Amino acid sequence: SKVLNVWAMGDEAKSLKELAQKFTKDTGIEVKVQVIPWANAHDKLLTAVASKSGPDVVQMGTTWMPEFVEAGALLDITKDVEKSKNMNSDLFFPGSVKTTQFDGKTYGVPWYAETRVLFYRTDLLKKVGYNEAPKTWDELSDAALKLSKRGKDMYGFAIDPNEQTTGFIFGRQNGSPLFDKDGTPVFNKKPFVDTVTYLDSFIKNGSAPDTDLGLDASQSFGGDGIVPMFMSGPWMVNTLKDTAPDIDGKWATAVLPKKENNESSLGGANLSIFKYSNKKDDALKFMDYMSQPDVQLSWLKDTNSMPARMDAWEDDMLKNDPYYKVFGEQMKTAEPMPLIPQFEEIAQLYGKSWEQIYRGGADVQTQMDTFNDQVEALLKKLEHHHH
Numbered sequence: 001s002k003v004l005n006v007w008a009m010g011d012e013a014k015s016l017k018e019l020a021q022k023f024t025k026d027t028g029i030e031v032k033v034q035v036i037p038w039a040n041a042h043d044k045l046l047t048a049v050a051s052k053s054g055p056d057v058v059q060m061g062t063t064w065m066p067e068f069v070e071a072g073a074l075l076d077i078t079k080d081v082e083k084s085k086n087m088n089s090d091l092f093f094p095g096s097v098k099t100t101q102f103d104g105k106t107y108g109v110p111w112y113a114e115t116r117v118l119f120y121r122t123d124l125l126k127k128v129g130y131n132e133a134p135k136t137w138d139e140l141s142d143a144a145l146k147l148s149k150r151g152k153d154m155y156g157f158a159i160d161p162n163e164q165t166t167g168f169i170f171g172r173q174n175g176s177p178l179f180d181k182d183g184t185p186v187f188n189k190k191p192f193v194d195t196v197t198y199l200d201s202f203i204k205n206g207s208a209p210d211t212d213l214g215l216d217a218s219q220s221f222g223g224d225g226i227v228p229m230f231m232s233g234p235w236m237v238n239t240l241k242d243t244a245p246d247i248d249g250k251w252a253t254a255v256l257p258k259k260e261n262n263e264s265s266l267g268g269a270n271l272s273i274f275k276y277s278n279k280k281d282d283a284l285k286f287m288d289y290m291s292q293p294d295v296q297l298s299w300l301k302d303t304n305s306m307p308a309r310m311d312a313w314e315d316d317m318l319k320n321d322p323y324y325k326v327f328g329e330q331m332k333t334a335e336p337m338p339l340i341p342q343f344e345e346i347a348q349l350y351g352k353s354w355e356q357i358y359r360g361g362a363d364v365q366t367q368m369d370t371f372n373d374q375v376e377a378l379l380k381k382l383e384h385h386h387h
């Protein structure tokens with residue numbers, strides 16, 4: 001009734017819950033935090049739109065901002081944040097801000113940022129003649145295959161078939177804009193087709209698993225390094241520091257290997273107010289409280305998470321930590337996924353087409369033709385609804 005309902009996601013939700021207790025002590029505003037896995041959160045959000053009932057404050061994945069702004073689900077808080085000391089846009093990285101601003105209006109406040117980098121076993125790489133991380137597509141491919149030739153049940157790299165960013169990150173790296181100047185999708189043109197060919201090459205030559213082996217990171221990346229390289233974000237630095245003592249000083253991160261460029265994705269999450277909330281004032285206090293820079297830095301540093309706020313990267317410990325150095329370097333050129341309202345549907349269509357390739361053995365060009373037509377059909381639909 002007067003309890004403030006917050007929907008949060010992943011491991012970061014634990015930090016939000018703990019900080020919500022100081023909030024309630026200082027304000028008397030009781031808070032109830034619902035934790036939703038990232039793999040269910042999209043369904044849950046769609047349901048809340050359709051029924052017009054949901055939380056008061058919602059953690060929003062950056063890639064879903066366009067969709068839910070479009071759907072009328074997030075409150076225009078432009079007036080409230082442009083004035084605040086701790087929620088004004090100019091504190092945050094412009095890539096993070098692009099995920100909150102649509103048609104001159106602001107629909108949330110960046111809570112944390114992330115980008116994806118290469119994780120690698122330094123000892124295993126040296127064993128196959130690499131004293132440094134692979135720095136090119138050709139190097140990554142070469143090192144992976146040398147690593148998978150150690151033996152049966154031993155690989156060189158992983159491609160996560162459920163990761164929305166992967167195909168698109170590599171596509172940009174090979175010069176594909178994903179969508180051309182007109183918004184026409186170009187997944188069936190050569191830059192993207194050769195991208196998918198390249199990713200599939202790891203699966204076909206046995207350097208990347210073609211199924212879920214069911215191992216946690218410590219069992220796959222640690223020990224003798226069944227999977228000795230992979231791509232992920234800050235949350236995995238945290239995980240590996242806590243769960244893989246056996247490989248202390250035998251792994252590192254590095255910026256992504258380059259093809260035409262080594263651009264990564266820019267993600268993370270925003271805090272937003274659900275447009276149908278009857279506790280808008282309370283929600284905004286909670287947002288403001290969660291944006292105090294010291295409060296933020298406390299949990300971000302603890303978790304090796306990347307701040308979306310710029311002056312936070314001036315902190316002595318962030319500047320000098322080797323994991324933050326690599327993240328910070330990668331973030332310089334990281335770009336959000338296409339900030340379009342059908343992003344998730346498109347990423348799930350990619351997933352299906354990827355699976356047809358890597359598991360079904362479909363032809364890449366033929367599958368990309370099919371995929372691109374699917375995407376064109378979706379975009380044309382949206383345009384008819386708009387015009």
Ligand SMILES: OC[C@H]1O[C@@H](O[C@H]2[C@H](O[C@@H]3[C@@H](O)[C@H](O)[C@@H](CO)O[C@@H]3O)O[C@H](CO)[C@@H](O)[C@@H]2O)[C@H](O)[C@@H](O)[C@@H]1O
Pocket residue numbers: 009010011012038060061062063064114160162163164233235266267268269
């Ligand atoms: O796609 C939604 C949202 O994800 C945000 O990444 C968070 C990450 O979640 C990943 C999933 O997005 C991904 O589908 C699966 C695929 O195997 O793997 C991850 O779980 O979880 C981390 C730990 O909670 C978060 O730090 C991370 O933010 C992404 O940042 C965001 O831009 C995107 O909208």
Ligand SMILES: [Mg+2]
Pocket residue numbers: 147148149150151152153154155206
């Ligand atoms: Mg092998």
